């Protein structure tokens, strides 16, 4: 870029409000087909996609999310919906703008956009100014120098999208390859009932009234609001060592597993984690230690494998907010093999999911680092 | 909604001008007085019709609607005569107006009812202007074959903002009280609330089925009053048609009239009562066959025991509960044991959350019969019904038609519930109802199709990383 | 809002909603309606199909100036059928007041009941008069005692009637007699404020600098003379006839309609007022009107010694602490009575 | 909480046994009567102390507390005498008991207050048993130097479940009314709600500062009643100490008493009123200097204009708002223009969300003065205060101490707000307050340190993919 000029935004930008929607109909299941695209995660399910006066989302506009936010940005992918809050941004000019260029230029400035704090509309304010522009060598090669850098950002965005895609396919193929192996076991592996594996410990919760029992201390507390990880090493809450006077808990060793019994199941998959520190958990989940005839990671992968049907064994337990019974959870039989059919198979399968999972030696360790160097090179490219 | 929805909005406009219950009492009394006046005028002048009437004085002729409708309005104290002298001092003659139909001692009174419109009110001119404005606004309601009370249903539904029914669910449980039984009577109701769920069958079966008027019982005082005027609006015969006030757990009546032939109900939930219990209500006629009472936090199944007490030799029964009363400890377990002692409990059908007014939980309906085959059949039902925005759904007449088709002859339809056995329910700990939904959408894939795709991901990925390394020239 | 005897008194306005006023016609039991003559005239000239035109209508009027005094009454005659029109006033018209208009008894009719000033004075509601001319200057004695209304109207100038020696001796008289007539003969006395009204703006532009400079000289005579804070206000103008014979022509609210020799003179006087009193009112279309209101409020509490007046503070203003009025002007039947009403309150 | 928190829990136990407001009226009247009786006995017998008293009849001596506390309790109608004859038929003598202190015509009555405890109630024996049980339960409150009303603060905070203040924020705005000005008076309040925010200064300054009693005005009737008993509990002099009932937008009083010297307030938000406006309230003494009214959806700044009307030549002012009143269209823009016409608006300080009872928004406080330097200074404040679980925080006495240190002499502290200029605010469109928070945590990295790490990721990645390809032997 030989000549650089900053220009105001709304000079070269056509802003328009959404075409009117009534897309709140009685069923919009996955059998339907429109992409309903909102803020945060930009996808809700199908809907019948024609004759509703849908904007149809032509070749390359951009959007902004939204009132109280004005930070979230999404490329209009192909031809999609007008989903319920969106505000449409495009340009009047064609031979200078090519507004995926300015899609890339808009996320360059989180200066105000690190402040979603006050109830507020920002339309005129970002609609003023500024952005840098390769003017005044327009219309000769103004977009022609862009093709380099927009190719750079397109390769990088392509990288991010495919890495998410191969992570998804990797977990998909991995879960499909887990239980093809390791299962239907013959012949004939012992149908050992759960709890005949090691005396496991229930739970317990101190009240938050006594600030003595709550404010300090170095015992790692575990809560299922803080679960959803895998291989938990530490949590948000560290509870008081005095509080074991009336915690109604048990301090457990540092090679344990744990499993929820409340409110993520009754709907979905139940999490579990290798807890590597001595810790306690609340009323609402269970801690398990096995007993010595085993290798503990094999028990972990066995439970995480058979989760989708041990939830099925005791699913409903009433229309209450709570979930799976104690007894039918306790009274499930798993094939427990000989030790050579513990350590080898858990070595292969542990090597596999430790290739997949967070953080150190992992795929997200590639993902967010390429995200960081992405944004760094973005900010690196855009000065004068 | 054709010519209706405008008048629904007119009622919404009339909703002024203070907190809703206070003026709402006067609103309901006004439309009640208007409808009784118009119905009485329609009776006495279906043929010379007179807007203004006379003091014709013939008591012997007067007592014959006092045997038929049980109430003379008056000679000249009708609404249409009173609508001429509006804004006229004073207004308290309406109190004396309520003296007129409340004579009604011959026969089978059903009076002692209209004590709603009291006086507050701070000056007499405030009372005059306010009540005259209410009468003027209720006079302009262009309604006049003569469907009237659905706006009353709207206005009574416009509160707790109690929880009664989204009315297609009431039509559903009415179709559960089906079928093919021209057999006196219908219908008893414990804890009726409104007469909304006590309406659909005979309003659909005005001369299709001919059994008797309706009986019931309800807890609250003002809910009892609005229930009696609710059932009175819909042009229903005076014959025996009533509800008495009280509680079924404390004043169970009427035992002597009769073992009923069909019942529906909406019992409220978590309705803890006196424990456990201080009188001998174990040793009554209905809880002694169970074996134990229904304590405070589990105060639900006392209603269903009281329901199954008042039942015929053949006629079915249908009640609503929520599926959280599942096993609920050993007391409710042995209650369930006496319920499954026979084919007393015939069918159970679940209903997806919410389909109510912000509750937000799911429900289920229990259909009982002393009309057996016998095996237990847990035909529960999940999705689909839309729920939240307007009503919603509300609700899919073909879906309830096909669930009646399923209820007809005992099919075994997967991706849906099916029959079970008595051996199955004794294999359960009498659970309500885990069995028998099957589908889970756990869909298979292909090893090779996934892995060569992942190889394509890599062949994209590594060269794009190479091009990033090219772009690392800074 | 002073009609809140009844609670609520249905004191409704459109302001200026002829659609709102005809809605109030359509609305029932706001059984009193207060409206201007201008709103009524806008309603009549804008709308001529009202249902009120064949209805029992009562009218009561008050404070009649001379813009729509006959024309809105001609619309009242034209676009109505059944009216009972009554008047409250302090302004009779009939014998010698207007001489060219429809008189009160010919506008309204019978003098239905009257309450003259006389027995009200007798019943201690207002106070008495002492009206004296200041035959003090034998130079302009003939011109002060001149009664030729043609020459007093026409040959009024800045030298034969506003002479600097004449204005100077007026000033010396009033500054000698102020603390006597305001009962300020003692230091711990209570005191009263006073007004000085004239008929021409250039007189007042002479007066402000005249009083200021002569107070400077009086303070420089012996370094003992207590000065007097003297303020003044006016905008514009004797705009129309606006009245009968003879009252004050009302000043409008146009700020700089006169020259800045009058306007910026007033502005500099208000800047000196701000410099002494720490106030914020500029002379725009907003600060001037509330400046007038603020000066009206702080002249009432005897914190302003003397008020020079062109044409305001004569009809609607009340001052319970003001005993003494000074006039260099020629007046008439009852506009002069409205001027004299600005002292006599008990 | 030392010996307190148990008694807070005892009040929670006493909270039975119906919906809270209804019995709560009787609870507050009971503790009110108990405290007046104990204070009156403490006055009349500080030295021979008698549990039971006599009919000593000396009226001339009786009228002297009727000049001092303004109320004789009675000879024998105190609480401690009435606590002997509990459960005694009948109970309605308490009504006649309220006749006794309500004599009080000499001088400056402050009576006509205690009409709370009405009768419902369905039988006389129900009334006797219920009110006697309430008196017995309130008698057992072991309180007795004599801090009493914080449990009253708890019970009045236990509702809208209105929104008054988390009381350390009231202590904060009290410290905003600081400092160093022993200058009559304090404190006027428009829309006071409770007397909670009208308490902290003189309760801390009982003889430290000596100015006058408190004045104020409040909208609701029962809130006015609980406010008067709230301010009456805390052992405050009878002198002029009162609040009158009404609305400041409709009945602004008192103009004549006086131009005040310090004010705090909690005006409610979005409080739409009569428009726009039908009377001449443009041309009053306080809205004509602005230039335009405060319309319906923007009904906030009428309170702050009414606040700045009643102010001294020197004394500062402090009000609360929410930062959503930011520019709010051109009407509120020109309102802001007349606010920034001088250094009327001195400082603004933001406060992080929520720090309230489920509102859930942030707030800010505006401190005004006719005590100028002058430049505008937007010392807004973000995090940190904890917010949600117990109260919370509540709240960090060193943090408010150092924000008073910042407020003392005009520092310019980054990672925090600082001063601005009048040229800055006319460069703004009078915005409240974007300037001047700076920190964003946009932290740099290193090219080479990132890329050789990524190279280490690759050297792990490719050989692990090779080992997966080894593991593809199936």
Curated annotation (Swiss-Prot), chain A:
> Can you name one GO molecular function term for this protein?
DNA binding
Protein's UniProt keywords contain GTP-binding: no
Statement: the UniProt record of this protein carries the keyword Cytoplasm: no
- What CDD domains does UniProt report for this protein, alphabetically? RMtype1_S_Eco540ANI-TRD1-CR1_like, RMtype1_S_EcoR124I-TRD2-CR2_like
Start and end residues of each stretch annotated as Conserved region 2: 338-384
**InterPro entries, per database record:** Restrct_endonuc_typeI_TRD (IPR000055), Restrct_endonuc_typeI_TRD_sf (IPR044946), Type-I_RE_S_subunit (IPR051212)
**Record remark: domains:** Contains two DNA recognition domains (TRD), each specifying recognition of one of the two defined components of the target sequence.
Q: What else is known?
A: Type I restriction and modification enzymes are complex, multifunctional systems which require ATP, S-adenosyl methionine and Mg(2+) as cofactors and, in addition to their endonucleolytic and methylase activities, are potent DNA-dependent ATPases.
Similarity comment text for this entry: Belongs to the type-I restriction system S methylase family.
Q: How does it assemble?
A: The type I restriction/modification system is composed of three polypeptides R, M and S; the restriction enzyme has stoichiometry R(2)M(2)S(1) while the methyltransferase is M(2)S(1). There is an equilibrium between R(2)M(2)S(1) and R(1)M(2)S(1); the latter is methylation and translocation proficient but restriction deficient. (Microbial infection) Holoenenzyme interacts with Escherichia phage T7 protein Ocr; this interaction leads to the inhibition of the restriction activity, but may still allow methylation and translocation.
This chain belongs to which protein, by name? Type I restriction enzyme EcoR124I/EcoR124II specificity subunit
The record lists the lineage as: Bacteria, Pseudomonadati, Pseudomonadota, Gammaproteobacteria, Enterobacterales
From Swiss-Prot, chains B, D:
Query: What residues bind S-adenosyl-L-methionine, as annotated?
Result: 162-167, 194-196, 218
> Which InterPro entries does the entry link to?
D12N6_MeTrfase_N, DNA_Adenine_Mtase, DNA_methylase_A-5, DNA_methylase_N6_adenine_CS, Restrct_endonuc_T1M, SAM-dependent_MTases_sf, T1MK-like_N_sf
Q: Which residue stretches belong to region C-terminal tail?
A: 445-474
Q: Where is this region: N-terminal domain?
A: 1-161
Catalytic reaction annotation? a 2'-deoxyadenosine in DNA + S-adenosyl-L-methionine = an N(6)-methyl-2'-deoxyadenosine in DNA + S-adenosyl-L-homocysteine + H(+)
Q: Which UniProt keywords apply?
A: DNA-binding, Methyltransferase, Plasmid, Restriction system, S-adenosyl-L-methionine, Transferase
Q: Which SUPFAM superfamilies does the entry mention?
A: S-adenosyl-L-methionine-dependent methyltransferases (SSF53335)
Q: Where is this region: Catalytic domain?
A: 162-437
Q: Enumerate the Gene Ontology biological process terms.
A: DNA restriction-modification system; methylation
* EC code(s) of this entry: 2.1.1.72
Which molecular-function annotations from GO does this UniProt entry contain? DNA binding; N-methyltransferase activity; site-specific DNA-methyltransferase (adenine-specific) activity
Q: Which Pfam families match?
A: HsdM_N, N6_Mtase
Task: Fill in the domain comment.
Answer: The C-terminus is required for assembly of the restriction enzyme complex. The individual domains assume different positions in the enzyme, allowing the holoenzyme to regulate the methylase, endonuclease and translocation states.
What is the recorded function of this protein according to its Swiss-Prot or TrEMBL entry? The subtype gamma methyltransferase (M) subunit of a type I restriction enzyme. In the presence of the R subunit the complex can also act as an endonuclease, binding to the same target sequence but cutting the DNA some distance from this site. Whether the DNA is cut or modified depends on the methylation state of the target sequence. When the target site is unmodified, the DNA is cut.
Extract the NCBIfam families matched here: hsdM (TIGR00497)
Family assignment? Belongs to the N(4)/N(6)-methyltransferase family.
Name the PANTHER family on file. SITE-SPECIFIC DNA-METHYLTRANSFERASE (ADENINE-SPECIFIC) (PTHR42933:SF1), SLR6095 PROTEIN (PTHR42933)
Protein name as catalogued:
Type I restriction enzyme EcoR124I/EcoR124II methylase subunit
Swiss-Prot record, chain C:
Source domain of life is Bacteria
Q: Where is this region: Motor 2 domain?
A: 124-346
Motif DEAH box per UniProt: ranges: 62-65
Q: Which cysteine pairs are joined by S-S bonds?
A: none
In this protein, which residues make up the domain named Helicase ATP-binding?
Answer: 1-93
What's this protein's function? The restriction (R) subunit of a type I restriction enzyme that recognizes 5'-GAAN(6)RTCG-3' (for EcoR124I) and 5'-GAAN(7)RTCG-3' (for EcoR124II) and cleaves a random distance away. Subunit R is required for both nuclease and ATPase activities, but not for modification. After locating an unmethylated recognition site, the enzyme complex serves as a molecular motor that translocates DNA in an ATP-dependent manner until a collision occurs that triggers cleavage. The enzyme undergoes major structural changes to bring the motor domains into contact with DNA, allowing DNA translocation.
Per UniProt, subunit arrangement is:
A monomer in solution. The type I restriction/modification system is composed of three polypeptides R, M and S; the restriction enzyme has stoichiometry R(2)M(2)S(1) while the methyltransferase is M(2)S(1). There is an equilibrium between R(2)M(2)S(1) and R(1)M(2)S(1); the latter is methylation and translocation proficient but restriction deficient. (Microbial infection) Holoenenzyme interacts with Escherichia phage T7 protein Ocr; this interaction leads to the inhibition of the restriction activity, but may still allow methylation and translocation.
Q: What is known of its domains?
A: The individual domains assume different positions in the enzyme, allowing the holoenzyme to regulate the methylase, endonuclease and translocation states. Deletion of the linkers between the domains prevents movement and thus restriction activity.
Q: Which family does it belong to?
A: Belongs to the HsdR family.
Q: What protein name is recorded for this chain? A: Type I restriction enzyme EcoR124I/EcoR124II endonuclease subunit
According to its UniProt entry, this protein's organism is: Escherichia coli
Gene that codes for this?
hsdR
